[PDB]
Design a protein around this ligand. Structure first.
Ligand SMILES: O=S1(=O)CCCN1Cc1cccc(F)c1
Ligand SMILES: O=S1(=O)CCCN1Cc1cccc(F)c1
Length: 284
């Protein structure tokens, strides 16, 4: 039975190596990574790979790894797939921990925009979680933390992290991670997966997919929002993604909004992530 070497980038930035039989489904590899991570609350997470166009794709746990990676390397990342709107309701601290690591990368990367003050507050909770109580010994007036807190670091930001860290004395890692999550979860791009698209008139928009529904970002002024309840159906055909919207009471016919994606594969990817978010953040 022939086995392929898999390389997984973990959220702490380290590499996990393992082998699976070459006809393995994605679930086999995912189960191995989650066991390595001592992670029980697995439903929020998934593995990504990069396709031949270099786009991030979710590894479907139900299908053969080889029919997804196709010609590419068996190289993956471990990621948050479904960002819980209320992280306080996760049953385990270790779940909250991996969620924090994913959000730190979301912030540093600029996928999750954040005010100065929220960058410093989030950074201060990470420091408290990782170093414990503020100590002046590892911090003179010139201190710069090894921790990456932001897409662009400034001395003013480093100073503010230290000022807020002083205030967290006696806070345990689990408590600091919970505070990190209570702040992060309120940010307007928390858990939003953005896709480049054109509207029916060819104007460049972004479609966001999250727990609460679909977002159309036409610009900072005029942002269309479709709670899942309002979304009747979604479809893709060629390079097109269409969404059907419920009529309001005593209106006769659903409305159709169509979008143009860059190519057929981008349309299909958007459709699948929407179906999966609808299925997950339907239930309750
Ligand atoms: O994701 S969580 O916040 C973490 C545990 C409780 N959560 C479930 C949830 C949230 C929103 C809608 C729904 F059907 C189920
Ligand atoms: O529309 S479907 O592709 C039909 C089969 C799966 N779909 C689920 C769905 C229903 C409603 C909203 C939504 F985003 C996804």
């Amino acid at each position: 039975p022939k086995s392929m070497q898999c390389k997984v980038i973990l959220l702490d930035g380290s590499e996990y190596t393992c082998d699976v039989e070459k006809r393995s489904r994605g679930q086999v590899l995912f189960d191995k990574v989650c066991e390595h991570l001592n992670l029980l609350e697995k439903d929020y997470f998934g593995l990504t790979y990069r396709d031949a166009e270099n786009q991030k794709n979710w590894l479907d746990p139900a299908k053969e790894i080889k029919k997804q990676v196709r010609s590419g390397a068996w190289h993956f990342s471990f990621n948050v797939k479904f960002y819980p709107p209320d992280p306080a309701q996760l049953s385990e601290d270790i779940t909250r921990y991996y969620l924090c690591l994913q959000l730190r990368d979301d912030i540093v990367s600029g996928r999750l925009p954040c005010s100065f003050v929220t960058l410093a507050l989030l950074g201060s909770y990470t420091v408290q979680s990782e170093l414990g109580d503020y100590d002046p010994d590892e911090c003179g007036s010139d201190y710069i933390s090894e921790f990456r807190f932001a897409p662009n670091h400034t001395k003013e930001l480093e100073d503010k992290v230290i000022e807020l860290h002083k205030s967290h004395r006696g806070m345990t890692p689990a408590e600091a991670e919970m505070h990190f999550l209570e702040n992060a979860k309120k940010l307007s791009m928390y858990g939003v997966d953005l896709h480049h698209a054109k509207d029916s008139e060819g104007v460049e928009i972004m479609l966001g997919v999250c727990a609460s529904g679909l977002l159309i970002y036409r610009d900072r002024l005029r942002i269309n929002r479709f709670a899942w309840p309002k979304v009747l159906k979604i479809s893709y055909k060629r390079n097109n993604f269409y969404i059907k919207i419920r009529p309001g009471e005593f209106e006769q016919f659903e409305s159709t909004i169509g979008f143009k994606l860059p190519n057929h594969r981008a349309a299909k990817r958007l459709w699948k992530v929407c179906v999966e978010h609808h299925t997950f953040f339907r239930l309750l």
